[PDB]
Structure 1
Amino acid sequence: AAYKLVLIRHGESAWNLENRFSGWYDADLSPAGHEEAKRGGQALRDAGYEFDICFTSVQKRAIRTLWTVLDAIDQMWLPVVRTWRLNERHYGGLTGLNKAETAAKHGEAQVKIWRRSYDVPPPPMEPDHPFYSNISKDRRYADLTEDQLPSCESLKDTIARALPFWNEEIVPQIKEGKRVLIAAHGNSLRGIVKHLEGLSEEAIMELNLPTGIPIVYELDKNLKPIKPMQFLGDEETVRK
């Protein structure tokens, strides 16, 4: 094909072990998730992949995934571009709650509505929320406009603010011939996969990208996939 694009979703975080909603909270990788990034980078190294530019979020679990990959493939010298538009979905007032706290406060019906819905956001993260200063006042977002800093996101909102970065900054690099690596999160990568394959709301909400595994697209000159996405790795991990 004309072009080849590689995505990687970061693995287990510290808050995953606590089964807390992270969203925009800057949870680090857990030791296991860091090991996953190492395995994915080894897969890219064995396959001989080369890149010219990398994109990631401003969240350290993705940035550390990308760092671990670049180390494994001996491409630490590549230019790296960080953007809040590749961040995980903003889970609003659910941020920091675990499964039990969420069910206790909102009930199983409302939580299932939020889980299955494409465009119903969770509650806003209000100023008295325990992580409100930690996230909404973090200087890394100081240049966002009032309308851009979200208090909460549905998957629709998340995709809506990720796709502008893809169209304006990633697409030109790809069409310039640069080999792109994107290290990011489940829901932002959902936005990209939905755009690439023209998937339905229901189809994207059923797609669970694997973590720590290189996802390869072969793209024609209009950036439309010529075949299904492929996973890199040994036979076992590729199986699962």
Structure 2
Amino acid sequence: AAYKLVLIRHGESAWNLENRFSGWYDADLSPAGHEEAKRGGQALRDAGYEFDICFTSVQKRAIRTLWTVLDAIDQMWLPVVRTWRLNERHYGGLTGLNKAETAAKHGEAQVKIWRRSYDVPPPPMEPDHPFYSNISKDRRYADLTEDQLPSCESLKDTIARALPFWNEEIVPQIKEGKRVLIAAHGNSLRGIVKHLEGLSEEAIMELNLPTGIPIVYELDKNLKPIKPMQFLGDEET
């Protein structure tokens, strides 16, 4: 194929352990998620993968996943670009709640609506939210215009602010011949997959990307996948 693209979704965070919604909250990897990242890097290493540029979010679970990979494949000297546009979905008011508090507070029907809807956002994170300032006033977002910093996001929203970065920053790089590695989050990566494969909103809702596993696309010169996405690792995983 003309081009090769590798994506990796970060692994288990500290907050997955507590069953808490992270979104834009900057949770670090759990030890186990760190190990997933190591296994993924080892898979790239064993397959002799080489990259020229790396993209990731401004969230430390994705950034650390990237570091761990670059270490495994002995390519820590690569340029790395970080952007909020690759951030996890902003879960708004649900940020910091766990599963139980959320089901108790909103009921099964409303939670099903949130999980199954493509353009239904969860409640906005209001200024009295425990993490309002921790997130909304983090200087790493100082450069965002008033309307780019979200209070909550549907999947459509997350994909809408991620795809501009794909089209304007990564695509040019792929067409330049640069081998690209994107280390990010399930939902912004969902956006990229939906675009690459022209999936329906229904299909993309069905799709969950495996964590800590390198996801290889062989693409033609128009960035059209020449075959289904493949994973790297041992025969088991």
**Same-fold call, TM > 0.5?**
yes
Deviations 1:100-154 (CA, angstroms, capped at 9, x unpaired): 1001111111111111100000000000000000000000000000010000000
> Are 1:54 and 2:54 matched, yes or no?
yes
Find the counterpart in structure 1 of residue 126 from structure 2: 126
Alignment of 1:200-219 (within 5 A): 200-219=200-219
Give the secondary structure class of the aligned counterpart of 1:44: helix
Q: Measure the CA separation in 1 of the matches of 2:100 and 2:117.
A: 20
Deviations 1:26-83 (CA, angstroms, capped at 9, x unpaired): 0000000000000000000000000000000000000000000000000000000000
Give the secondary structure class of the aligned counterpart of 2:81: strand
Find the counterpart in structure 2 of residue 192 from structure 1: 192
Q: Measure the CA separation in 1 of the matches of 2:56 and 2:140.
A: 14
- Per the TM alignment, residue 157 of structure 1 is displaced from its structure 2 partner at its CA by 0.2
Q: Measure the CA separation in 2 of the matches of 1:105 and 1:236.
A: 40
- Per the TM alignment, residue 174 of structure 1 is displaced from its structure 2 partner at its CA by 0.2
- Per the TM alignment, residue 219 of structure 1 is displaced from its structure 2 partner at its CA by 0.3
Instruction: Out of 107-116 and 146-155, give the one that drifted further.
Output: 107-116
Which segments of 5 or more consecutive residues in structure 1 lack a partner in the other structure? none
Give the secondary structure class of the aligned counterpart of 2:148: coil
Which segments of 5 or more consecutive residues in structure 2 lack a partner in the other structure? none
- Alignment length, in residue pairs? 237
Q: Measure the CA separation in 1 of the matches of 2:47 and 2:108.
A: 45
Give the secondary structure class of the aligned counterpart of 1:5: strand
The TM-score with structure 2 as length reference comes to 1.00
- Per the TM alignment, residue 89 of structure 1 is displaced from its structure 2 partner at its CA by 0.3
The TM-score with structure 1 as length reference comes to 0.98
Q: Measure the CA separation in 2 of the matches of 1:99 and 1:2.
A: 44
> Are 1:103 and 2:112 matched, yes or no?
no
Deviations 1:166-224 (CA, angstroms, capped at 9, x unpaired): 00000000000000000000000000000000000010000010000000000000000
Q: Which runs of 4+ in 1 moved over 2 A?
A: none
Q: Measure the CA separation in 1 of the matches of 2:182 and 2:13.
A: 18
